[PDB]
């Protein structure tokens, strides 16, 4: 098949990547604007340039214990459609091609969880970086309750 | 003369405080170098997009990015120097005082 | 004691050297500083070849030629200020050898 | 002795000389900028007549015009620059002439 | 007479950090004509990228590589007259050098 | 003899400022090394658009950038040389002083 | 006299096999030189062989020439300052062995 290239971030000192063509801009994380009562998942909303965008979680979706603003220090906005939605990470790494042969099975045992959600493991030079479906995740686990 | 031991000793907080001014300037441009870097992977993304045309300005991209870790080199090789000279001060109020002693 | 104020004076010496090797190293980065924004007008010829794919490019091309001023803007500044080191440590060699004749 | 005082007005009127040498190359420099200036707005009507292939020429151009600022402000800041150094000839050859005098 | 002598060495300093601050600012015109040559190569290669719609850019390209020549020449001219300059600055302290063993 | 000492020590100072000469061309060649590299990224830019048919080009231009890198490194060695070149003076022109005063 | 004048002529005869090492790096810049000049002709060879996709390219490749000539004649002005050197070293030799005898 044709290369596909990841973009390459940083969560729970592990590292990840997710679809290029998504991601929309890399900012600075800086304090969230909260509204009461809202599913864990979800962090607030923040105004970038006048635009509204929610801001979500990674880290307790992927069960990390990295503190809020402390750890870290990124937001990756990322756009499906008609929503924007920025990822909390820690940090960026480098825009990366990959073909598929690259790409191993995750390690993972839950079904769905190690398929549809994730890709596999990019191997480089004997390294790994976790490589996640953001679009069935985003569209999976925010419209299952 | 113990007025000119004072004196040095003056001096040596003078170019301590000096020490210290270098490192606050060279340490906001080892963080302009950072804010470099992440701009330099804004502009592959931003390259990706423009597919055959974008694969020009990828190249230039690559090269802030380093020109951004090369700038952080030399920010640390000024930071070694600004230790040494550090190292320096203390062991020249350390002779100075020394001096005074004997 | 006039040897460990020889010392003294030797330790002047060192930390000149010490400015000396550091004046270099911010010439690198002004050097640095003058090639990003070579990189910066790379950019903006791209974005304008790009054209209608260009406009994020532009905003790059901007970014970084701002980065590369206030970094040459910082490295003027700490070149300056190594000057006034530099004056400073001679100054207190000075006073140092001046009061070897009394 | 007046001799040496003789000998230094004359290496004042050498140093006057020679700073206005320096400045008449700098006239030629503030034309050579004009004319780069001139130049730059010539490449605009250009560039607007070659239109989508005139796009990477346009900022080129840009660019030109911006160099062709730089070089007559320089240039005037050297001008200021003559003007403060002939007035310290002119205090210095009073301060050499009062010497004579004294 | 003591006092006039050590204004004139002040003086002296004065004029010799004013030569120094002109040869700075001549280091940006040298910069300036390097970045001159940059963009006339750059109008040369989006001539030869145009082709016949490339000549009106192909004229500048050959005009401002003259241009920067005459800056660069110009430049290097200054350069010369402030060798010549601080040579003549040598003479006049060695002169006032001269008067201190009279 | 004393004049003929003094004599020795101006004609090191000559070696000296002959040996800081070649520093001065250095830096030109450090300057030019910098210019091959805009050089070098021009043809990787050409080389980028052009793709199966600029793989020629694009290994020219990591050709060029080889051959620049290592002429920069060997400017380096020559810096280097002429620093131990400039120290060896010194102690030379010292030495000569040290046998006039024995 | 005595060991301290060896000690001078030993220090020249260092200086003096430290400019012929000097030399034989510039004699390998200036072939670095003139091969890189040959391997952009032959590339501009390539270019001339690639049709309207080669012109801009061959533009850069008689710019890289142009470095390379460029760097030749300095590093042949630079073989000039050795030889000037290495003359005022012979006329310092000549000096010290009439101080030797003096």
């Not at chain 2, 170098?33 to 020009?56: P, S």
């Amino acid at each position: 098949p044709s290369g596909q290239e990841f973009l390459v971030f940083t969560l729970g000192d592990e590292e990840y990547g997710i679809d290029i063509l998504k991601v929309q801009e890399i900012r600075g994380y800086d304090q969230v604007t909260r509204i009461a009562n809202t599913p864990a998942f979800i962090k607030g909303v923040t105004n970038l340039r006048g635009v509204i965008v929610p801001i979500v979680d990674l880290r307790i979706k992927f069960s990390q214990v990295d503190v809020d603003y402390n750890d870290n220090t990124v937001v990756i906005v990322l756009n499906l459609g008609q929503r924007v939605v920025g990822i909390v990470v820690d940090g960026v790494s480098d825009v990366l091609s990959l073909t598929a042969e690259q790409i191993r099975p995750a390690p993972e045992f839950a079904v769905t969880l190690s398929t549809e959600y994730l890709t596999g493991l990019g191997a480089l030079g004997d390294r790994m970086l976790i490589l996640v479906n953001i679009e069935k995740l985003l569209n999976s686990e925010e419209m299952a309750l | 003369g113990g007025k000119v031991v004072d004196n040095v000793v003056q001096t040596m907080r003078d170019i301590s405080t000096s020490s210290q001014k270098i490192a606050d300037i060279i340490s906001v441009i080892d963080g302009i170098a950072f804010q470099t870097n992440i701009l330099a992977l804004n502009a592959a993304v931003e390259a990706a997009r423009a597919g055959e045309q974008g694969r020009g300005f990828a190249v230039v991209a690559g090269e802030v990015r380093n020109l951004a870790q090369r700038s952080a080199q030399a920010a640390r090789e000024i930071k070694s120097l600004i230790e040494d000279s550090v190292g320096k001060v203390d062991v020249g109020s350390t002779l100075v005082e020394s001096a005074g002693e004997t």
